[PDB]
Amino acid sequence: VQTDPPSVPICDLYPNGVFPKGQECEYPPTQDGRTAAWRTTSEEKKALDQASEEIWNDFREAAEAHRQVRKYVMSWIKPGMTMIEICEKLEDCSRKLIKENGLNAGLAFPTGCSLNNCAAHYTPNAGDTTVLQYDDICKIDFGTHISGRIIDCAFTVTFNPKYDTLLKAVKDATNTGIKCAGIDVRLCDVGEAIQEVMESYEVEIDGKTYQVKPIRNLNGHSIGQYRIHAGKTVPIVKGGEATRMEEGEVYAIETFGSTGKGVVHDDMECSHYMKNFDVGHVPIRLPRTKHLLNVINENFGTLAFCRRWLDRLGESKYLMALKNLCDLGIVDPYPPLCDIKGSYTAQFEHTILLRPTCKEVVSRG
Numbered sequence: 001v002q003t004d005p006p007s008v009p010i011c012d013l014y015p016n017g018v019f020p021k022g023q024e025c026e027y028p029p030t031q032d033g034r035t036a037a038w039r040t041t042s043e044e045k046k047a048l049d050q051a052s053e054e055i056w057n058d059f060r061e062a063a064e065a066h067r068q069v070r071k072y073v074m075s076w077i078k079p080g081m082t083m084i085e086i087c088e089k090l091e092d093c094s095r096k097l098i099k100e101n102g103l104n105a106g107l108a109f110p111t112g113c114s115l116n117n118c119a120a121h122y123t124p125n126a127g128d129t130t131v132l133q134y135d136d137i138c139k140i141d142f143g144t145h146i147s148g149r150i151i152d153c154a155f156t157v158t159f160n161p162k163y164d165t166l167l168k169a170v171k172d173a174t175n176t177g178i179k180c181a182g183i184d185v186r187l188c189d190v191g192e193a194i195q196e197v198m199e200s201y202e203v204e205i206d207g208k209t210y211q212v213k214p215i216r217n218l219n220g221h222s223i224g225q226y227r228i229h230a231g232k233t234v235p236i237v238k239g240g241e242a243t244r245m246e247e248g249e250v251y252a253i254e255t256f257g258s259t260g261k262g263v264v265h266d267d268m269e270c271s272h273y274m275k276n277f278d279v280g281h282v283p284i285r286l287p288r289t290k291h292l293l294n295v296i297n298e299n300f301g302t303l304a305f306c307r308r309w310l311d312r313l314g315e316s317k318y319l320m321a322l323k324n325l326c327d328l329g330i331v332d333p334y335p336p337l338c339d340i341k342g343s344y345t346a347q348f349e350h351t352i353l354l355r356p357t358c359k360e361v362v363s364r365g
């Protein structure tokens with residue numbers, strides 16, 4: 001059985017190596033009204049699904065580690081704790097349950113804990129003294145992987161009930177997107193359903209009223225092996241590309257709500273970095289720059305990492321070497337994305353598998 005606090009890896013909790021399936025759903029029907037129910041019992045669809053079973057089973061192990069980590073996080077996350085303490089307590093648990101093993105099993109990306117106006121990509125770097133406050137709105141976004149099969153899943157943490165309707169708007173739009181998603185469904189269609197649900201909500205925060213806005217330049221995306229964003233974007237506003245979702249694909253269905261401008265800009269010190277997937281081998285002679293890239297290739301490959309994870313490996317005075325990799329185009333920085341000062345942003349995100357037989361919300365129990 002799992003301990004309190006959790007320390008037993010998911011692998012050890014299922015000796016047979018069969019992890020629990022997430023929520024399974026029938027696909028949404030067409031414009032004329034034809035059901036997708038036929039997929040659930042088709043010989044040809046069941047065959048293709050069973051062929052990728054070892055893969056679905058990898059996302060399930062990673063998803064079960066994510067569920068047990070976020071239930072544990074919800075039990076102790078309180079104002080007064082620093083952002084370093086939150087991330088380290090979360091990551092230590094994540095490492096134990098995923099049974100971290102180099103590139104074969106581990107953390108798929110750094111622990112986002114973005115606050116207030118900052119919607120995404122904020123994790124503390126060393127020496128960051130930020131402390132979580134009672135009126136803060138914190139987005140916990142973390143990832144787990146087994147053999148590069150990534151679970152991208154996020155939720156918003158608040159202590160003041162004044163943000164309840166803001167969270168409810170975004171949660172409902174994320175559920176809408178998950179519901180609309182499916183094989184042959186246009187990506188712009190999923191984006192318009194999300195916007196329609198989010199804008200139906202009106203919030204009052206400290207005597208001020210707002211209609212919840214989707215963050216138009218933030219969006220859902222496709223997931224590939226060892227690739228967080230595989231190229232297909234799921235918009236959260238009207239206007240997006242009429243490109244369609246295909247069979248066997250994996251999507252992260254995230255939506256963002258804001259009381260601000262509904263658009264985000266790079267701000268603050270960067271913590272998130274990721275090697276560019278399309279960049280091949282680049283011989284480097286600069287010794288410190290060479291060393292840092294070998295550290296990246298060994299420990300992260302093409303998965304995102306943060307500076308705290310470099311400090312953790314015993315690395316120091318690597319900022320110039322890291323800047324060199326960024327300017328060379330080998331590494332891309334992913335700085336914090338903020339809306340305007342004084343605005344509030346919320347996020348909810350699940351991972352969905354577009355299986356031949358059904359739609360599996362693998363990150364939801």
Ligand SMILES: Oc1ccc(Cl)c2cccnc12
Nearest residue numbers: 109141152228229272304334
């Ligand atoms: O949900 C996420 C968290 C962190 C990062 Cl760096 C991401 C990059 C691309 C897409 N989604 C992401």
Ligand SMILES: [Mn+2]
Nearest residue numbers: 141152153154
């Ligand atoms: Mn995420």
Ligand SMILES: [Mn+2]
Nearest residue numbers: 152252254349
């Ligand atoms: Mn994501």
